[PDB]
Design a protein around this ligand. Structure first.
Ligand code: ZN
Length: 413
């Protein structure tokens, strides 16, 4: 069989081959192959296993991995990629001890980014986002989820969504778009938040017709949107055919997790303050818990989401950068992996499954990304490390040697 490409001399290969999301104990069952090969033809994986799996094939292009570690391209299931300006001028408020919510309550935070995003032209946001997405790619992310939510109005929310589609069609990273019009409350709506929510819901039909988003998200937090508003909002979104996601129980056990499970949301994200009942509902419903360790770290806190309890309870855990200018300005998914190990107390095996398979399922791409097996798009990363434990171990840097998307190297050294 004549094929396009073959990777040889792979020191360690992680296919992450699974039949579905990995919950509980299965997150620990990492299949490791040594001295492996990977065959690619017409942008797809034709084989990925131990040396000898290439018997019967002959490739034209041969890539020597020189004993390096090879894994599927990484999946970042939660980001706010498109945004205007930056929030460095808020560093001092945080340092002074002003809480994240108090900054928001005073017209800052998300609202500050909303003003800059509304003012930035669509072309500026595109170029701006292109730079950050290119960096994400250089760190190993070949598939990512991007949320709007910095417009809080028709014009800018649609603008963010169009930029996301544009990005998806003009660079390597495959993007999953999420509409998060219900991110915060414009000051002029503080007295009628339900009216604001209805105006955001009024956008679903055109967003749907334009295929501008596949999911709907919402910030269920004290002072922001309540559980009842979130239930009504999300149920409405589901009726329109949108998948469901939620920024839940970021500080306190508000019942955001319980709601997400009851609504059978694809994922519940953040969850630092979630209760045991919430954890049980997520596991029971199969709702993926996307943890954002960088956000906790960046907020200057030390109390992280209870990942071990979630895994002990059969929850499917994932990880993300939550890349956003306000609470987690980092594109480095590898650092997220390091923080998960050091502060979420997750093992290297669990972390790898979290940033590939589980991240993929968290955004409706379980059948398309996160695994290197026959038929899958040839998206992989060749690492500057001999083993998988080394990646989360050595922190704050970029271990990427080369990144392959659709069978072509898109990042070199
Ligand atoms: Zn977020």
């Amino acid at each position: 069989k004549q094929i396009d490409t073959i990777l040889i001399n792979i020191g360690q290969l992680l296919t992450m081959e699974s039949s579905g999301p990995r919950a509980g104990k299965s997150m620990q069952d990492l299949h490791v192959i040594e001295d492996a090969v990977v065959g690619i033809h017409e942008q797809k994986i034709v084989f990925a296993g131990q040396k000898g799996a290439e018997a019967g094939y002959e490739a034209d292009e041969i890539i020597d991995c020189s004993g390096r570690l090879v894994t599927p391209g990484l999946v970042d299931p939660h980001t706010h990629l498109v945004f205007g300006g930056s929030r460095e001028k808020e560093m001092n408020l945080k340092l002074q001890g002003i809480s994240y919510l108090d900054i928001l309550a005073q017209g800052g935070g998300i609202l500050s980014t909303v003003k800059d995003t509304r003012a930035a032209s669509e072309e500026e946001l595109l170029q701006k986002a292109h730079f950050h997405l290119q960096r994400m790619l250089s760190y190993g992310t070949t598939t990512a989820e991007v949320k709007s939510g910095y417009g809080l109005e028709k014009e800018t929310e649609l603008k963010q969504l169009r930029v996301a589609k544009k990005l998806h069609e003009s660079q390597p990273v495959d993007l999953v778009s999420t509409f998060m019009g219900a991110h915060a409350i414009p000051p002029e709506y503080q007295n009628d938040p339900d009216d604001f929510l209805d105006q955001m819901l009024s956008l679903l039909p055109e967003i749907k017709e334009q295929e501008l988003a596949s999911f709907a998200d919402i910030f269920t937090e004290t002072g922001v949107f309540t559980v009842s508003q979130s239930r009504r909002y999300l149920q409405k979104a589901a009726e329109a055919g949108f998948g469901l996601k939620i920024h839940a129980d970021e500080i306190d056990p508000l019942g955001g997790a319980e709601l997400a499970g009851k609504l059978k949301a694809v994922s519940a994200d953040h969850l630092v303050g979630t209760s045991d009942e919430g954890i049980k509902k997520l596991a029971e419903a199969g709702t993926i818990a996307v943890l954002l360790p960088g956000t906790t770290f960046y907020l200057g806190k030390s109390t992280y989401a209870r990942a071990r309890a979630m895994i002990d309870e059969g929850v499917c855990v994932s990880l993300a950068t939550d890349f956003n200018p306000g609470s987690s300005p980092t594109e480095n998914i590898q650092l997220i992996m390091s923080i998960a190990a050091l502060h979420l107390k997750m093992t290297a095996e669990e972390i790898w499954h979290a940033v590939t398979v589980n991240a993929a399922y968290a955004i409706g791409k379980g059948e398309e990304a996160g695994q290197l097996k026959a038929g899958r798009s040839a998206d992989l990363v060749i690492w500057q490390a001999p083993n998988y434990m080394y990646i989360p171990y050595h922190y704050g840097v970029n271990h990427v040697h080369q990144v392959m998307k659709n069978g072509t190297i898109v990042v070199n050294r």
